């Protein structure tokens, strides 16, 4: 289909309780495939999907080395950030990095990413050109200047256009049973009386993969955006996701309301109504 690969990294300092904890996970689309936690008994990058297990020791050795090296650099960078922001050493701080690539149906690069956040706020991001930077503030500009001096973007571009795309292709093929299978939503509408005067209609979508979905209510064909309660798409724990959308309907109006569902696993968008 269109597809993505992402690596997520978080270091959280904890002054007086040892060294910062480092956790990194890798995803293809919405499927977790690798993990590393510095607080693990014997930290190694570990597989989380059957299709990666076939990779050889050379792969795992290099992944684990990379993980450990980043834990170390993140610790140095956390120290640097205290200086850049004129901060005390007493508090816990957070440093995050996301990078990866999006590819289209033909396997060609659509977009690459490489960006960081400090204490939950944008710090520095590689622009879509894979050649220039956006620094959030005058502290990040210090890093920008160093990274421009060292031609960092050129090195990241090479990865994002190269190994990122090629290895994502490989994973898609090795994991084609699951990664290239869309599970459509199982859908139904439920009715929950609130009072004599009104009831909730809740439109459910269950057991779908990947997570992207659109769930809408209309009344007399008009979208009910402002009156629809829409929950965040949530993991079921069996690889699939769930979502619902609910509206409060006056008694006897239920047939004016229609639930509309779009998912890549569906050949045509669905229309549902409450069926007493």
């Amino acid at each position: 289909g269109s597809h993505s690969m992402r690596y997520f990294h978080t270091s959280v300092s904890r002054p007086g309780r040892g060294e910062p904890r480092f956790i990194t996970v890798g995803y293809v689309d919405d499927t977790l495939f690798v993990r590393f936690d510095s607080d693990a008994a014997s930290p190694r990058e570990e597989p989380r999907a059957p299709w990666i297990e076939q990779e050889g020791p050379e792969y795992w050795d290099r992944e684990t080395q990379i993980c450990k090296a980043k834990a170390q650099t993140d610790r140095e960078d956390l120290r640097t950030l205290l200086r850049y922001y004129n901060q005390s050493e007493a508090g816990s701080h957070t440093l995050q990095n996301m990078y990866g690539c999006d590819v289209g149906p033909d396997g060609r690069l659509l977009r690459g990413y490489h960006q960081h956040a400090y204490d939950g706020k944008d710090y520095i991001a590689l622009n879509e050109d894979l050649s220039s930077w956006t620094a959030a503030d005058t502290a990040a500009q210090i890093t920008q200047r160093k990274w421009e001096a060292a031609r960092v973007a050129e090195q990241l571009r090479a990865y994002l256009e190269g190994e990122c795309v090629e290895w994502l292709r490989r994973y898609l093929e090795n994991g084609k049973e699951t990664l290239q299978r869309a599970d459509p939503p199982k859908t139904h509408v439920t009715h929950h009386p609130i009072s004599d005067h009104e009831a909730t209609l809740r439109c459910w979508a269950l057991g779908f993969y990947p997570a992207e979905i659109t769930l809408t209510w209309q009344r007399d064909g008009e979208d009910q955006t402002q009156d629809t309660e829409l929950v965040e798409t949530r993991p079921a724990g069996d690889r699939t996701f769930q979502k619902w959308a609910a509206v409060v309907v006056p008694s006897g109006e239920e047939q004016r309301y229609t639930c509309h569902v779009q998912h890549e696993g569906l050949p045509k968008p669905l229309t549902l109504r409450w069926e007493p």
């Binding site: 690596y7 090195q155 990241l156």
Partner: peptide, 9 residues
């Protein structure tokens, strides 16, 4: 597969 890390901040 992962990337080489960038330089320090």
């Amino acid at each position: 597969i992962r990337a080489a890390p960038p330089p320090l901040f």
